[PDB]
């Protein structure tokens, strides 16, 4: 359709993040994930934020055509209860954070 | 003679084309009707502009044409009236009739005609089988309703020379009816005839076969037509 | 009883007694079938009818009534059965307004002035200032003192210019898209081609809670009246069913009517983007069928269900429920790389094998080039191995995050249940009857 994915899915998106809202957040005493090429199928329980630090990851929800892409730099809040499933073409690296209601 | 006919398949051959304009002065000369039944060969498929540029000069010595409905919207437009038998109103029928899903029996305007007629030109025929024959005059314009049963024999049914019945039938009835070009219920009774011939030359194998009789074309369009059609 | 039955087959089924408008045949029929079989009729109304058979009498009938053959043919085009209560619309004190600008302005993807936007968006404020009728005397200006220069419409002025310069940029985009969307035309759709008059208000000219005078163009018996407000999309009042059996007797087309926006949608995906209700007449006390949701389109890049329920307000495709509570399952730890990583391990252990001997299937080629053979011949000389590990130091990272998740999953309940915040996505799990070798 005509409304993209990020609207439809409220999927909130802060690409090439400033350094001082990094240090705002505490990016660099999150958690660290990475991956290469490969295929991840996840139901979101919680709220995620996700800081890409290396590569690229396209997001495709469930029963979708379309999809999301996220590149080195972006900072991505995935939404409680979102289903989808992240497609890896190259090497991956991420820092993350899972909020609870409320916390930030 | 009295009617020259001839097809397009002789303007694949430079030879014939050239004796074909000096039988067409000489007939013309004599005063007799030249009748084009166009039967595009597989060539001059290919495309429509240089199909027109190729007929152009046999279609204005023609005083009758035979087209098939195919064949004269290749000439016009074929995807124009393609589209046009493929729209479906998204709501509602602008009419009860369109709610039925009927066949498309499109009718040409005139108007739309206009880009192949000319002053010479006594009578148009635009056959869909023998379902439909559109007619075309300087005065007039119309269409007569035919069938056609090829169900009926299923294991002797072939339609190849069905098409030259048809025409065969229309200079029958020309020729002897003179008032068929000025009279338009003259024109429709005797087309009539034309459509049964058609209708019984696709119950047999083979063209020559099966091309009918007089009486037996006479006796069907009687059966067929109620008797106020005659 | 046939009482509650009828009244049953109105309110569930939506039955109602619409006028059969019969043809003498017809008529006859169901009078003269009531007496009998092959009977004398005795009844006048059967008999009369056996008259009326042919058309001959009728005109003779006509005549000496002294009315017209149209005429009758009108009469029998009437409501039969009783009227509903004539209205009686009040006003509830005088109408009084402003010109405020639609808080939606300008429309996504139109750059504006933002400064002047700013000096637009002040007007805002001023839905929030009290007004009471026993003030609207002390300073009232009227006649001379009521001429338009002598009002403060600044607000609503820089919105105009700004509205004038994107109607000139985008009002043949739009009719463009218009053809491109909607094959035809339908009330709520944009008016286009030769019906399209300069001056016609597009979309972003209006807003909810604006005061309209229009007339009513079309009728549905199953959507409503559509209006026309002015604008290049006609208004919507939802009315269906039932309730057009009396509100018909009132609401009727070309009439003069006073509406007011209760919403305002994308004629993309919603059929009628302008939702109204009638003011002058009132008939909210007629209107009993309602939409659940406001109809939609179903386009050809609409695939999947799940964005279309998102990009309008419609629940999600329930499923059953599955029984178990997601903080009480077993944590994930199986990298999804790792399988990647095995494959890549075989390939170079079996290269490493070549290299010393000669110095329902599925088939996974694996190439050269994402292969560590440097490192690999190293170890294979030197000799869990370090491929092995490389996966367990990913399985680690993917068990920590799911403990992560699972830990925040934990904090997230309790303060649901303290809040009464859903646990599930709401209109998801809908209920029933709704469809060793370790050890040895």
Same mark, same amino acid.
């Not at chain 2, 998204?90 to 066949?103: G, H, I, L």
């Given at each position: 359709?005509?409304?993209?994915?990020?609207?439809?899915?409220?999927?909130?998106?802060?690409?090439?993040?400033?350094?001082?809202?990094?240090?705002?957040?505490?990016?660099?005493?999150?958690?660290?994930?990475?991956?290469?090429?490969?295929?991840?199928?996840?139901?979101?329980?919680?709220?995620?934020?996700?800081?890409?630090?290396?590569?690229?990851?396209?997001?495709?929800?469930?029963?979708?055509?379309?999809?999301?892409?996220?590149?080195?730099?972006?900072?991505?809040?995935?939404?409680?209860?979102?289903?989808?499933?992240?497609?890896?073409?190259?090497?991956?690296?991420?820092?993350?954070?899972?909020?609870?209601?409320?916390?930030? | 003679?009295?009617?020259?006919?001839?097809? /397009?398949?002789?303007?694949? /051959?430079?030879?014939?084309? /050239?004796?074909?304009?000096?039988?067409?002065?000489?007939?013309?000369?004599?005063?007799?009707?030249?009748?084009?039944?166009?039967?595009?060969?597989?060539?001059?498929?290919?495309?429509?502009?240089?199909?027109?540029?190729?007929?152009?000069?046999?279609?204005?010595?023609?005083?009758?044409?035979?087209?098939?409905?195919?064949?004269?919207?290749?000439?016009?437009?074929?995807?124009?009236?393609?589209?046009?038998?493929?729209?479906?109103?998204?709501?509602?029928?602008?009419?009860?009739?369109?709610?039925?899903?009927?066949?498309?029996?499109?009718?040409?305007?005139?108007?739309?005609?206009?880009?192949?007629?000319?002053?010479?030109?006594?009578?148009?025929?635009?056959?869909?089988?023998?379902?439909?024959?559109?007619?075309?005059?300087?005065?007039?314009?119309?269409?007569?309703?035919?069938?056609?049963?090829?169900?009926?024999?299923?294991?002797?049914?072939?339609?190849?020379?069905?098409?030259?019945?048809?025409?065969?039938?229309?200079?029958?009835?020309?020729?002897?009816?003179?008032?068929?070009?000025?009279?338009?219920?003259?024109?429709?009774?005797?087309?009539?005839?034309?459509?049964?011939?058609?209708?019984?030359?696709?119950?047999?194998?083979?063209?020559?076969?099966?091309?009918?009789?007089? /009486?037996?074309?006479?006796?069907?369009?009687?059966?067929?037509?109620?008797?106020?059609?005659? | 009883?046939?009482?509650?039955?009828?009244?049953?087959?109105?309110?569930?089924?939506?039955?109602?007694?619409?006028?059969?408008?019969?043809?003498?045949?017809?008529?006859?029929?169901?009078?003269?079938?009531?007496?009998?079989?092959?009977?004398?009729?005795?009844?006048?109304?059967?008999?009369?009818?056996?008259?009326?058979?042919?058309?001959?009498?009728?005109?003779?009938?006509?005549?000496?009534?002294?009315?017209?053959?149209?005429?009758?043919?009108?009469?029998?085009?009437?409501?039969?059965?009783?009227?509903?209560?004539?209205?009686?619309?009040?006003?509830?004190?005088?109408?009084?307004?402003?010109?405020?600008?639609?808080?939606?302005?300008?429309?996504?993807?139109?750059?504006?002035?933002?400064?002047?936007?700013?000096?637009?968006?002040?007007?805002?404020?001023?839905?929030?200032?009290?007004?009471?009728?026993?003030?609207?005397?002390?300073?009232?200006?009227?006649?001379?003192?009521?001429?338009?220069?002598?009002?403060?419409?600044?607000?609503?002025?820089?919105?105009?210019?700004?509205?004038?310069?994107?109607?000139?940029?985008?009002?043949?985009?739009?009719?463009?898209?218009?053809?491109?969307?909607?094959?035809?035309?339908?009330?709520?759709?944009?008016?286009?081609?030769?019906?399209?008059?300069?001056?016609?208000?597009?979309?972003?000219?209006?807003?909810?809670?604006?005061?309209?005078?229009?007339?009513?163009?079309?009728?549905?018996?199953?959507?409503?009246?559509?209006?026309?407000?002015?604008?290049?999309?006609?208004?919507?009042?939802?009315?269906?069913?039932?309730?057009?059996?009396?509100?018909?007797?009132?609401?009727?087309?070309?009439?003069?009517?006073?509406?007011?926006?209760?919403?305002?949608?994308?004629?993309?995906?919603?059929?009628?983007?302008?939702?109204?209700?009638?003011?002058?007449?009132?008939?909210?006390?007629?209107?009993?069928?309602?939409?659940?949701?406001?109809?939609?389109?179903?386009?050809?890049?609409?695939?999947?269900?799940?964005?279309?329920?998102?990009?309008?307000?419609?629940?999600?495709?329930?499923?059953?429920?599955?029984?178990?509570?997601?903080?009480?399952?077993?944590?994930?730890?199986?990298?999804?790389?790792?399988?990647?990583?095995?494959?890549?391990?075989?390939?170079?252990?079996?290269?490493?094998?070549?290299?010393?001997?000669?110095?329902?299937?599925?088939?996974?080629?694996?190439?050269?080039?994402?292969?560590?053979?440097?490192?690999?011949?190293?170890?294979?000389?030197?000799?869990?191995?370090?491929?092995?590990?490389?996966?367990?130091?990913?399985?680690?990272?993917?068990?920590?995050?799911?403990?992560?998740?699972?830990?925040?999953?934990?904090?997230?309940?309790?303060?649901?249940?303290?809040?009464?915040?859903?646990?599930?996505?709401?209109?998801?799990?809908?209920?029933?009857?709704?469809?060793?070798?370790?050890?040895?």
């Amino acid at each position: 359709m005509q409304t993209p994915l990020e609207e439809l899915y409220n999927v909130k998106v802060e690409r090439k993040v400033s350094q001082r809202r990094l240090e705002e957040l505490g990016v660099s005493r999150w958690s660290v994930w990475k991956t290469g090429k490969c295929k991840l199928p996840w139901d979101w329980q919680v709220d995620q934020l996700v800081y890409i630090e290396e590569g690229e990851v396209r997001v495709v929800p469930e029963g979708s055509k379309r999809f999301m892409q996220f590149l080195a730099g972006d900072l991505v809040r995935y939404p409680k209860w979102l289903e989808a499933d992240l497609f890896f073409n190259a090497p991956y690296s991420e820092r993350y954070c899972f909020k609870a209601y409320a916390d930030d | 003679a009295r009617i020259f006919h001839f097809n /397009s398949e002789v303007l694949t /051959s430079p030879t014939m084309e /050239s004796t074909l304009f000096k039988a067409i002065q000489w007939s013309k000369k004599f005063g007799g009707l030249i009748f084009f039944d166009l039967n595009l060969p597989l060539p001059l498929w290919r495309s429509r502009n240089e199909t027109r540029k190729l007929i152009k000069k046999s279609w204005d010595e023609a005083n009758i044409i035979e087209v098939s409905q195919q064949e004269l919207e290749f000439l016009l437009d074929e995807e124009y009236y393609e589209r046009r038998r493929n729209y479906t109103p998204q709501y509602f029928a602008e009419d009860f009739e369109q709610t039925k899903n009927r066949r498309d029996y499109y009718h040409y305007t005139p108007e739309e005609i206009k880009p192949l007629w000319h002053d010479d030109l006594k009578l148009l025929v635009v056959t869909d089988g023998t379902l439909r024959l559109h007619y075309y005059t300087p005065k007039f314009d119309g269409v007569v309703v035919g069938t056609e049963d090829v169900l009926i024999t299923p294991f002797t049914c072939d339609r190849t020379g069905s098409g030259d019945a048809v025409v065969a039938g229309i200079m029958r009835k020309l020729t002897t009816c003179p008032e068929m070009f000025e009279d338009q219920d003259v024109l429709e009774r005797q087309l009539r005839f034309a459509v049964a011939a058609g209708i019984i030359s696709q119950w047999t194998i083979g063209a020559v076969r099966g091309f009918p009789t007089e /009486s037996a074309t006479q006796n069907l369009k009687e059966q067929v037509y109620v008797p106020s059609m005659w | 009883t046939e009482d509650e039955a009828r009244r049953r087959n109105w309110i569930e089924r939506g039955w109602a007694p619409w006028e059969e408008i019969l043809t003498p045949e017809a008529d006859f029929a169901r009078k003269s079938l009531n007496e009998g079989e092959e009977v004398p009729l005795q009844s006048p109304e059967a008999i009369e009818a056996f008259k009326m058979l042919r058309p001959s009498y009728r005109k003779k009938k006509i005549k000496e009534m002294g009315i017209t053959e149209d005429e009758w043919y009108a009469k029998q085009f009437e409501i039969r059965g009783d009227k509903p209560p004539p209205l009686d619309t009040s006003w509830a004190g005088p109408l009084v307004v402003r010109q405020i600008p639609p808080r939606d302005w300008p429309p996504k993807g139109w750059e504006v002035d933002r400064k002047e936007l700013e000096f637009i968006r002040e007007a805002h404020k001023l839905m929030a200032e009290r007004v009471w009728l026993e003030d609207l005397d002390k300073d009232l200006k009227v006649g001379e003192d009521a001429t338009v220069d002598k009002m403060c419409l600044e607000r609503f002025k820089v919105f105009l210019k700004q509205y004038n310069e994107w109607v000139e940029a985008n009002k043949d985009r739009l009719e463009e898209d218009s053809y491109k969307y909607d094959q035809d035309f339908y009330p709520g759709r944009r008016i286009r081609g030769k019906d399209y008059k300069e001056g016609m208000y597009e979309l972003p000219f209006y807003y909810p809670g604006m005061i309209c005078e229009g007339t009513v163009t079309t009728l549905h018996l199953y959507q409503g009246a559509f209006v026309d407000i002015g604008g290049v999309h006609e208004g919507w009042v939802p009315i269906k069913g039932n309730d057009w059996f009396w509100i018909r007797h009132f609401i009727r087309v070309g009439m003069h009517v006073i509406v007011e926006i209760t919403a305002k949608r994308d004629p993309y995906r919603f059929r009628f983007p302008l939702e109204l209700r009638f003011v002058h007449p009132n008939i909210d006390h007629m209107i009993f069928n309602k939409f659940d949701f406001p109809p939609i389109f179903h386009r050809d890049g609409d695939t999947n269900p799940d964005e279309i329920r998102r990009d309008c307000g419609r629940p999600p495709e329930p499923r059953k429920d599955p029984g178990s509570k997601p903080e009480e399952e077993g944590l994930l730890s199986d990298h999804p790389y790792v399988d990647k990583l095995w494959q890549l391990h075989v390939a170079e252990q079996m290269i490493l094998d070549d290299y010393e001997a000669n110095p329902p299937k599925v088939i996974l080629k694996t190439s050269v080039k994402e292969l560590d053979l440097e490192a690999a011949l190293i170890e294979r000389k030197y000799h869990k191995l370090r491929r092995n590990i490389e996966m367990d130091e990913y399985d680690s990272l993917h068990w920590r995050r799911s403990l992560e998740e699972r830990e925040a999953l934990l904090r997230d309940i309790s303060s649901r249940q303290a809040l009464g915040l859903p646990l599930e996505e709401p209109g998801r799990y809908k209920p029933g009857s709704f469809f060793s070798y370790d050890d040895a």
